[PDB]
Design a protein around this nucleic acid. Sequence first.
RNA 1: GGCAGCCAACGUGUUGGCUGGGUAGGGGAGCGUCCUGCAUCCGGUGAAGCCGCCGAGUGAUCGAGUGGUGGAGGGUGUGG
RNA 2: AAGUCCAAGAGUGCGGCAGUGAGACGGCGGGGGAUAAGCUCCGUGCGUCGAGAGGGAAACAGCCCAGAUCGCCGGCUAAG
RNA 3: CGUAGACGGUGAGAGCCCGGUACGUGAAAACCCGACGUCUGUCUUGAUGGUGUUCCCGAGUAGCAGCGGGCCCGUGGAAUCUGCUGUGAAUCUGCCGGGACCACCCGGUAAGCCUGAAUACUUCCCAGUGACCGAUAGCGGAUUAGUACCGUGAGGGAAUGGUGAAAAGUACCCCGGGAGGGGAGUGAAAGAGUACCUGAAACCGUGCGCUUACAAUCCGUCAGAGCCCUCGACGUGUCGUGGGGUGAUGGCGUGCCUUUUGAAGAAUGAGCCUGCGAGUCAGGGACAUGUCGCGAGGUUAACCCGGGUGGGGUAGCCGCAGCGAAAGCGAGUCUGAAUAGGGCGUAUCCACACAAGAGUGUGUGGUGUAGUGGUGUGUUCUGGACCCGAAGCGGAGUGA
Lengths: 124, 145, 63, 209
Amino acid sequence: ARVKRALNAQKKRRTVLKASKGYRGQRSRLYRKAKEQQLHSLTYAYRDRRARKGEFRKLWISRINAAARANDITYNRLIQGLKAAGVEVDRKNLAELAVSDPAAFTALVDVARAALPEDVNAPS
Amino acid sequence: VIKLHDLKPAPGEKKAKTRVGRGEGSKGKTAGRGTKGTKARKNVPVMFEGGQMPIHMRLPKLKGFKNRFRTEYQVVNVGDINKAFPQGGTVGVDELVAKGLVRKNSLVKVLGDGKLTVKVDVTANKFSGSAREAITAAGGSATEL
Amino acid sequence: PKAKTHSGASKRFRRTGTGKIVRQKANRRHLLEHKPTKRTRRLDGRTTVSAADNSRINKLLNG
Amino acid sequence: TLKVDVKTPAGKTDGSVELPAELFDVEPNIALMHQVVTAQLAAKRQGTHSTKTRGEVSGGGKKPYRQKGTGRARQGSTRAPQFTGGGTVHGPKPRDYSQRTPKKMIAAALRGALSDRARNDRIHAVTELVEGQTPSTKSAKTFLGTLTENKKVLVVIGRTDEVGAKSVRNLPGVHVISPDQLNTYDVLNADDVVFSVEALNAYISANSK
RNA sequence: GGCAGCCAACGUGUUGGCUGGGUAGGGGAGCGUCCUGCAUCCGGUGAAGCCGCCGAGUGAUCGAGUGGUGGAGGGUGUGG
RNA sequence: AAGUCCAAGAGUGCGGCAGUGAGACGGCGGGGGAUAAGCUCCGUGCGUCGAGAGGGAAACAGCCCAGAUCGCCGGCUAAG
RNA sequence: CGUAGACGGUGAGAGCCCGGUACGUGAAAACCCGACGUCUGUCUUGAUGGUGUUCCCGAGUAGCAGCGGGCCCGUGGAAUCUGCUGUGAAUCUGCCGGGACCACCCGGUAAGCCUGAAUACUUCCCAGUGACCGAUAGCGGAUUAGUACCGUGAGGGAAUGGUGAAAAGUACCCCGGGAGGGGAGUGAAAGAGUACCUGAAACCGUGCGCUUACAAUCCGUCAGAGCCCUCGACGUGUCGUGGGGUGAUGGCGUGCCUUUUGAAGAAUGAGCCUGCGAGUCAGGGACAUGUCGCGAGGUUAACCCGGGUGGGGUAGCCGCAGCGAAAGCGAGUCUGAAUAGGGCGUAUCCACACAAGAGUGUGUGGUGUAGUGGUGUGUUCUGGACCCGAAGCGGAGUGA
Ligand SMILES: [Mg+2]
Ligand SMILES: [Mg+2]
Ligand SMILES: [Mg+2]
Ligand SMILES: [Mg+2]
Ligand SMILES: [Mg+2]
Ligand SMILES: [Mg+2]
Ligand SMILES: [Mg+2]
Ligand SMILES: [Mg+2]
Ligand SMILES: [Mg+2]
Ligand SMILES: [Mg+2]
Ligand SMILES: [Mg+2]
Ligand SMILES: [Mg+2]
Ligand SMILES: [Mg+2]
Ligand SMILES: [Mg+2]
Ligand SMILES: [Mg+2]
Ligand SMILES: [Mg+2]
Ligand SMILES: [Mg+2]
Ligand SMILES: [Mg+2]
Ligand SMILES: [Mg+2]
Ligand SMILES: [Mg+2]
Ligand SMILES: [Mg+2]
Ligand SMILES: [Mg+2]
Ligand SMILES: [Mg+2]
Ligand SMILES: [Mg+2]
Ligand SMILES: [Mg+2]
Ligand SMILES: [Mg+2]
Ligand SMILES: [Mg+2]
Ligand SMILES: [Mg+2]
Ligand SMILES: [Mg+2]
Ligand SMILES: [Mg+2]
Ligand SMILES: [Mg+2]
Ligand SMILES: [Mg+2]
Ligand SMILES: [Mg+2]
Ligand SMILES: [Mg+2]
Ligand SMILES: [Mg+2]
Ligand SMILES: [Mg+2]
Ligand SMILES: [Mg+2]
Ligand SMILES: [Mg+2]
Ligand SMILES: [Mg+2]
Ligand SMILES: [Mg+2]
Ligand SMILES: [Mg+2]
Ligand SMILES: [Mg+2]
Ligand SMILES: [Mg+2]
Ligand SMILES: [Mg+2]
Ligand SMILES: [Mg+2]
Ligand SMILES: [Mg+2]
Ligand SMILES: [Mg+2]
Ligand SMILES: [Mg+2]
Ligand SMILES: [Mg+2]
Ligand SMILES: [Mg+2]
Ligand SMILES: [Mg+2]
Ligand SMILES: [Mg+2]
Ligand SMILES: [Mg+2]
Ligand SMILES: [Mg+2]
Ligand SMILES: [Mg+2]
Ligand SMILES: [Mg+2]
Ligand SMILES: [Mg+2]
Ligand SMILES: [Mg+2]
Ligand SMILES: [Mg+2]
Ligand SMILES: [Mg+2]
Ligand SMILES: [Mg+2]
Ligand SMILES: [Mg+2]
Ligand SMILES: [Mg+2]
Ligand SMILES: [Mg+2]
Ligand SMILES: [Mg+2]
Ligand SMILES: [Mg+2]
Ligand SMILES: [Mg+2]
Ligand SMILES: [Mg+2]
Ligand SMILES: [Mg+2]
Ligand SMILES: [Mg+2]
Ligand SMILES: [Mg+2]
Ligand SMILES: [Mg+2]
Ligand SMILES: [Mg+2]
Ligand SMILES: [Mg+2]
Ligand SMILES: [Mg+2]
Ligand SMILES: [Mg+2]
Ligand SMILES: [Mg+2]
Ligand SMILES: [Mg+2]
Ligand SMILES: [Mg+2]
Ligand SMILES: [Mg+2]
């Protein structure tokens, strides 16, 4: 019972080659080089799927800091005051507030400053 | 009505063969052998120890000889006569072979292990002293061949 | 083909009624004068083979 | 303990045959008779498959070229396995596939299959298939059709009865076997098993002692 | 929010608690290929193969979902 | 004597199947060396790498933080 | 219709279209068989068991020795068989063998010769079959195949199948010197045109869409503007639980495999694609573990009868008693002078006693003891034994 191993062999080839479309060079033409590229591609996708949540938090913090300093307050004091006030909006939607409607951001900065110690450098 | 396609092996009967060296998912590129050495390609004989004197060569040969003229006996204990013969009676070698107490063509010696209670007439190649006392103290008689 | 028993090991090892494999202690064939009798008599009779060697001796005995 | 009526080709019945329960009322054993039929078909497997190893293919004696300096892979002959035309490595060689199951395993599988047919009224006894002196597939087919509607039937007949086996041999679903040759595979194929009085009595008497 | 391994409780399929990086290596359970017993189904109103589209599965992979090409054999179940 | 105890997935005994028997650097105790070596040889219920992904040290197996079941465009922190 | 539903072919799956199949019938001649006669030979100028001695019973042989060969037996205490050399008998109250040798007993009758059956094989012929291959497979050889070719020679030794159902194989016209094509026809199809079934990938073009000439890129991944296409909705261009293509730009980012303490490594291997290329099989082998049958039993091997996978086959093998070097004894046995300790053995557990807390023993009762044969898996033994690789060794030959 001899088998011709070509029906089964071609399946993963087609999978990997179809996944490797758009690759510049011979990484989209040859099954071996495309497979080598797919290894890196899926590890990189895992890595960046994990770090995307940090990149977006970085972006939100940067936008919030700029808007806060426009409102004449530092970012760190702003979120310290928001923690003190009990207003518990995350940095994502706090960035949507900074961009879309700045009046609510101004009011929220007012609340954060009102709920902040009379001396932030006091020994307490 | 069971047909040929209704037949199935008993659960747990058939195990799958371990096909080895068929990828890195299971057992690949070494087929469970690890890296190089003698064992990576052939084997080691079971009587090899690395060149030190083996276990079968540093120990003395067991003392004695074999005595090709040995007289071996197939042995029945007296307690089995009770079970085999609920009433006793005459009990030779060949009507003791039928009860599966000895092999078919061999010398038979009777030993006195269990407890014999029935009236029996035992004939055998040889007897034990305890067996003879048990046979005759239970009311029967024992004769050698 | 039927397996072959290792002959050098059969004339050295033996099994008891239960099935443990026994042995003969060494250092008792010559050069005996300087050995005290306590050493001489702690060196005779059989002794059961070690559990570490029981695996290879079994294969040599059954072949 | 079934009591199968014996039926004549005229459309009548003559008598009945008692089926001993130690022989036709056995609890079936799926695993056991799986093993028995698998062993049967293993004995049927003509294992006449063969290849040529590295040393059996034609040629190959020479070392193809010098072992060093040529800038090529080290190759020991042109009939090595990796070569085209080279020898097969672990390829088939002829095999005997029969395995020898114990006698009472086979016998028990027989009894279990026949009991399985008996519990469901798939056993029939007949005086004979067709009125003698001449085979006739037409009349034997009509009688067998009255006797059963299913597709496959075993027709267990004594070896001397040739007129009967001739008249039923060319029916597409009908398998003819002798009582002393009865096995579990043929009875599990059949939807019905059609004995003759002589063959049923013969199978009973071969197992009555 | 999803999965899985070990264990426990009622109880008899759930829930709960712990745990789930990994080479040599050990164990378990599976995907795809071909040949076959038995059973069923599909196919010149177009099988296989190939090329796609649109999808699917935790993985090998799947598509008795669909088109193009093609021109005669295939699928599925349960064993070997 | 307790602790842990829906776990350490711990000990011990018997058996089936192993791989391993070239280790590396760092902390502490030492031999050799010139109280040299990214040297060499030992000890260590010492660590990490090997066989370890992620964050820090510019980059930087072995240093510091921390042990990756998967997903999230949530939050709190560690070294820095 | 069927004693024929084997298998093929015929324009696609045919028992009833063809060849056939089941079943019957047929040989002039040659050859192979028997059978009956001529023929050939022998036996009967003759049979039988007795009663008492002499002769005969395979000679340069047996035996013996030296040196060898072969026996399970490697010179050993070494018989039996046997070669070369030397020496060398008896004819039956002889001689040979029974593992040195001797005695007694037993078996036989060397140095003369023929001999069927049961056993081994297949160049060749006939008929079949395959959980065999299906054109890089199977024979080296589906085709010029031991061919072409390579070598002085022994010798080595390839590659090459598929139009269609049927050649109906493209008349005629046009461009071209032809090759090749374009119309027209043939055909079910010419995405079947004797470069011919299907026609994948590598590789090579052409057309369109997006992008790209201030930019240091393991060539990806995550975020992402702009453009292009498509599916919905409202409507008539802008959103939407959308989907594709391409991507300016920004963050992160040191190939794969081997082998290493450690390689992106400037260590190895790999130009690319397609096809191929490595733990297999045999065995009552060994050990372990599943599963099944029978169970103190379990099972047959050769073999015999079955057009079968079925049935007989008790020879053996394993379990059933051990201790001992052995004679032997036997729930014991060995050692020993020891009712004196220890070794091994008496399945295992329960209780009740009697003795010591030096590790518990002894005994009376009870319970009662599990193996074996198929077969799957792992490992192993003997085999080329997971696959590939030397320099070299031997035999017989070819070459000045
Ligand atoms: Mg792209
Ligand atoms: Mg197998
Ligand atoms: Mg691996
Ligand atoms: Mg690999
Ligand atoms: Mg292993
Ligand atoms: Mg290697
Ligand atoms: Mg090594
Ligand atoms: Mg090793
Ligand atoms: Mg060996
Ligand atoms: Mg040495
Ligand atoms: Mg021996
Ligand atoms: Mg001595
Ligand atoms: Mg002394
Ligand atoms: Mg050769
Ligand atoms: Mg080169
Ligand atoms: Mg060679
Ligand atoms: Mg070949
Ligand atoms: Mg049989
Ligand atoms: Mg859970
Ligand atoms: Mg894990
Ligand atoms: Mg974890
Ligand atoms: Mg592994
Ligand atoms: Mg398929
Ligand atoms: Mg099937
Ligand atoms: Mg059909
Ligand atoms: Mg058509
Ligand atoms: Mg197929
Ligand atoms: Mg179509
Ligand atoms: Mg199609
Ligand atoms: Mg299978
Ligand atoms: Mg604790
Ligand atoms: Mg744990
Ligand atoms: Mg553990
Ligand atoms: Mg070493
Ligand atoms: Mg070392
Ligand atoms: Mg070290
Ligand atoms: Mg060092
Ligand atoms: Mg130091
Ligand atoms: Mg030092
Ligand atoms: Mg150092
Ligand atoms: Mg250290
Ligand atoms: Mg390593
Ligand atoms: Mg790390
Ligand atoms: Mg570690
Ligand atoms: Mg620290
Ligand atoms: Mg914080
Ligand atoms: Mg800090
Ligand atoms: Mg046909
Ligand atoms: Mg004579
Ligand atoms: Mg010799
Ligand atoms: Mg000799
Ligand atoms: Mg002769
Ligand atoms: Mg060929
Ligand atoms: Mg082809
Ligand atoms: Mg060839
Ligand atoms: Mg020439
Ligand atoms: Mg036409
Ligand atoms: Mg067509
Ligand atoms: Mg072509
Ligand atoms: Mg073509
Ligand atoms: Mg520019
Ligand atoms: Mg730069
Ligand atoms: Mg980028
Ligand atoms: Mg970068
Ligand atoms: Mg190296
Ligand atoms: Mg290396
Ligand atoms: Mg190095
Ligand atoms: Mg390189
Ligand atoms: Mg480089
Ligand atoms: Mg190297
Ligand atoms: Mg290279
Ligand atoms: Mg090849
Ligand atoms: Mg085997
Ligand atoms: Mg003994
Ligand atoms: Mg002594
Ligand atoms: Mg004792
Ligand atoms: Mg069993
Ligand atoms: Mg087994
Ligand atoms: Mg030579
Ligand atoms: Mg010459």
